[PDB]
Design a protein around this ligand. Sequence first.
Ligand SMILES: O=C(O)c1ccc(-c2nn(C(=O)c3c(Cl)cccc3C(F)(F)F)c3ccc(Cl)cc23)c(OCC2CCOCC2)c1
Ligand SMILES: O=C(O)c1ccc(-c2nn(C(=O)c3c(Cl)cccc3C(F)(F)F)c3ccc(Cl)cc23)c(OCC2CCOCC2)c1
Lengths: 263, 260
Amino acid sequence: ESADLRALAKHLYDSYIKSFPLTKAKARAILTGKKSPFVIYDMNSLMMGEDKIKFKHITSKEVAIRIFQGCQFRSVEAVQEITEYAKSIPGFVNLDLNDQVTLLKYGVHEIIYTMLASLMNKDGVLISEGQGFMTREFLKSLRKPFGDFMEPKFEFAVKFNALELDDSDLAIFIAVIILSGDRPGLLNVKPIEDIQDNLLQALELQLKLNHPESSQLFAKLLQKMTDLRQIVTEHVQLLQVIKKTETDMSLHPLLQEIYKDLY
Amino acid sequence: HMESADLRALAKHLYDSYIKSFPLTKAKARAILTGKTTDKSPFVIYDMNSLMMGEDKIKEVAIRIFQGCQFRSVEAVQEITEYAKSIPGFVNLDLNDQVTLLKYGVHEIIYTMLASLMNKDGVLISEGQGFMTREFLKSLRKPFGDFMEPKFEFAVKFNALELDDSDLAIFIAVIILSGDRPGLLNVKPIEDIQDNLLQALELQLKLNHPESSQLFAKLLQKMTDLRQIVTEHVQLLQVIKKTETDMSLHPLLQEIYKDL
Ligand SMILES: O=C(O)c1ccc(-c2nn(C(=O)c3c(Cl)cccc3C(F)(F)F)c3ccc(Cl)cc23)c(OCC2CCOCC2)c1
Ligand SMILES: O=C(O)c1ccc(-c2nn(C(=O)c3c(Cl)cccc3C(F)(F)F)c3ccc(Cl)cc23)c(OCC2CCOCC2)c1
């Protein structure tokens, strides 16, 4: 069944390439300088970059709020990209429909953090499919709670990126996250865990073949699900403080509805 | 990286030292819990009166039971510390990192090993001479009842894996040698030891549970559940402190909780 695991790994890689706009491979070529992105490093260059490149989401007039809501808007797009990718995981569309919704509902946050790291290095983050690069220092220096809402994402990404996974690795890793049998309210846990057992076998063989000199990389990656659960839990607490504190966060009620599951 | 023979040799070393370090093994706890023996039968505490009868056979009740947990947890810290010293490479580490590893690891290990003493109906106490029912613990007043029950909810899930002591000896050792603890000075020598321990755990689980697919991964996934439940525990215990002055913690636990 070694061949079946390789076929499963290739199936997921192919679908991961079609589902997501900017791959890690393309993102790293930009970040290392190997088509030069527009750089946002302070207030003036943000103004010029939105007026020349037109990063979509500009509809509150305060910069720190507007960037915060830009993160929320792009996360909404990623949820749909993740949902389409999930449909391509063998067995997923055969699950009970409520369980498919539950798995996506409780998984998207962990997957967004994971895939955000592909776009980050220690100095900043690629935006608009890599047309722009917004610096870490600019994000971290935004006022009041917003600066400290940004920085934990880089702190995780820098640690996660030290594993040096590529797209073929991440495609299986993301699928493993989705097929988590311990999500609250699942109705039929067994077929979810059966599929996850398949994905874990495929991820294990993938990492051994793709990183034969990286001892226990499989274990180290699974240990990163501890970082993922903990930071998603921190994330929820930070959002709640911003909601109860900030009276300048009003969008059209329709927009608020679109965003309901990330605010 | 390592040998089949060295990995097996390391598993036997850790199992042997685990038996020497911890008084009440899972194997003994299971024999007591399943019964069918006359000589090892526990006295069962399920209400106020049987607790009273239990003091003559083996100051407010919820406080008294909480202090029972705290006392055994301090003893467990001592036992865990002795076991850790036996893990090859551990005492050779920087001494500050040794403190750091134990500081952040004991709580996760206490939860793990507490599960060995539990089934869905209660927990063995006083070296297996007693059994205190889950329903009795959960019905303790004010915050204490809901402080007891989460330990049972984890244990029922963890016990479904059917680990035995020889498995747990390596699992506990992997937890201790976690290179991502806050404030570690030399992460590299810790990670080198853990990789060895992880190779040892992988082979142990493959040989001892050959029909249990991806038990290795499922067990590492439980190290994640442990991280979250320890955080809730610390968080709830702090709230309980601000209400209850009828209890201080033992200075060993007190220091471990300083900065969580
Ligand atoms: O292109 C992408 O794949 C992409 C993915 C994530 C973010 C992003 N999400 N995010 C959250 O807080 C988050 C996370 Cl991690 C998880 C769930 C929900 C949320 C949220 F609360 F947002 F709803 C961030 C915090 C800081 C930073 Cl630097 C980035 C993110 C992303 O930011 C795009 C913008 C970056 C700033 O300038 C404009 C574009 C792109
Ligand atoms: O024999 C053992 O190895 C043993 C180990 C742990 C407990 C125990 N610790 N504990 C905590 O809250 C805890 C933990 Cl997990 C970790 C660190 C600190 C603490 C604490 F906050 F206490 F300081 C519990 C909560 C509920 C339950 Cl049912 C058990 C525990 C233990 O209970 C001994 C019994 C004494 C007589 O009444 C029933 C319990 C035995």
